[PDB]
Amino acid sequence: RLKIVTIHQEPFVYVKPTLSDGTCKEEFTVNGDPVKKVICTGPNDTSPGSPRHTVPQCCYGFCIDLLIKLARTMNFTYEVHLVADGKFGTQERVNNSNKKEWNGMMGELLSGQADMIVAPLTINNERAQYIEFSKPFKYQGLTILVKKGTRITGINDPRLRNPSDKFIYATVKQSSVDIYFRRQVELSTMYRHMEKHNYESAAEAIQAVRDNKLHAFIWDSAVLEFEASQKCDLVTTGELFFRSGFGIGMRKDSPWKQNVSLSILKSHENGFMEDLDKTWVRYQECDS
Ligand SMILES: N[C@H](CNC(=O)C1=[SH]CC(Cc2ccccc2)=C1)C(=O)O
Numbered sequence: 175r176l177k178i179v180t181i182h183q184e185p186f187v188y189v190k191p192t193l194s195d196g197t198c199k200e201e202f203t204v205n206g207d208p209v210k211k212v213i214c215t216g217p218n219d220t221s222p223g224s225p226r227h228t229v230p231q232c233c234y235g236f237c238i239d240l241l242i243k244l245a246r247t248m249n250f251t252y253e254v255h256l257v258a259d260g261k262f263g264t265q266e267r268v269n270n271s272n273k274k275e276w277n278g279m280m281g282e283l284l285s286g287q288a289d290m291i292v293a294p295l296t297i298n299n300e301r302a303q304y305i306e307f308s309k310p311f312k313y314q315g316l317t318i319l320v321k322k323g324t325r326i327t328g329i330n331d332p333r334l335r336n337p338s339d340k341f342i343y344a345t346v347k348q349s350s351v352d353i354y355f356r357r358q359v360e361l362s363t364m365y366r367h368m369e370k371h372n373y374e375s376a377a378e379a380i381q382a383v384r385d386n387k388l389h390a391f392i393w394d395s396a397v398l399e400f401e402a403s404q405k406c407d408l409v410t411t412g413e414l415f416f417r418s419g420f421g422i423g424m425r426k427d428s429p430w431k432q433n434v435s436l437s438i439l440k441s442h443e444n445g446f447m448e449d450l451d452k453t454w455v456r457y458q459e460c461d462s
Pocket residue numbers: 262263294295296297298299315316348349350351354394416417418
């Protein structure tokens with residue numbers, strides 16, 4: 175049985191409690207089809223002070239539908255869990271030494287706590303040094319989320335490039351967003367500003383934008399465009415940048431890679447990804 179690791183990230187992965195009986199609530203799409211749900215174990219509370227308890231939860235969304243298809247197509251069984259530290263994955267020092275390790279899903283995949291990462295996981299060369307990716311299952315980029323009415327053009331807007339305290343922007347901790355900001359000369363000063371204010375999760379950053387505590391949130395367009403389309407008070411602004419894909423993650427020299435990529439190819443070829451888009455990404459007007 176493959177150990178699949180994933181992360182809470184709407185609309186790709188929804189995470190909800192079980193009912194009192196341990197079952198997942200019966201739900202239907204707008205088209206009337208049952209929402210496919212899998213059990214996923216993971217931490218139930220992320221609040222500072224609150225104890226961690228790893229409990230069965232209910233998972234569903236674009237990525238779970240993709241998983242279900244993959245497992246059928248390639249004839250594997252699986253069990254899903256949520257990444258224990260809540261992170262996508264960057265490199266960090268081990269015990270403040272010069273040796274480095276990955277945190278997040280990257281870290282679990284490398285340690286064997288997972289066999290496959292099935293998530294909105296950005297393909298990039300830093301991570302590709304350590305793991306294999308499928309071909310992209312979705313093409314996307316970064317964009318910026320703001321409150322409706324905020325006057326920002328994009329990543330080269332002087333309010334970002336020449337920041338005062340009057341305008342706070344941020345991304346998510348231990349995602350690939352920081353290092354690619356660091357590695358750019360034109361964006362080094364933004365990395366300096368942001369590492370001070372970054373959020374533990376996308377959900378918390380989004381909420382901070384709604385609550386006027388964060389003026390701009392830099393994050394995946396596949397996510398922010400959905401969020402802004404679901405919430406009438408939030409918008410995205412500027413051109414996509416750092417265009418890149420989401421891929422399935424596997425250990426180097428995994429025997430699964432070729433067949434995973436072939437599955438993803440078929441899904442781009444035959445309308446399946448577009449069907450998923452129509453189920454999870456664009457289907458109704460804002461209401462949340
Ligand atoms: N999906 C999340 C967050 N998204 C990111 O970290 C991103 S999206 C684009 C980007 C930079 C880049 C530049 C060139 C080539 C590839 C990526 C970083 C993750 O996996 O941590």
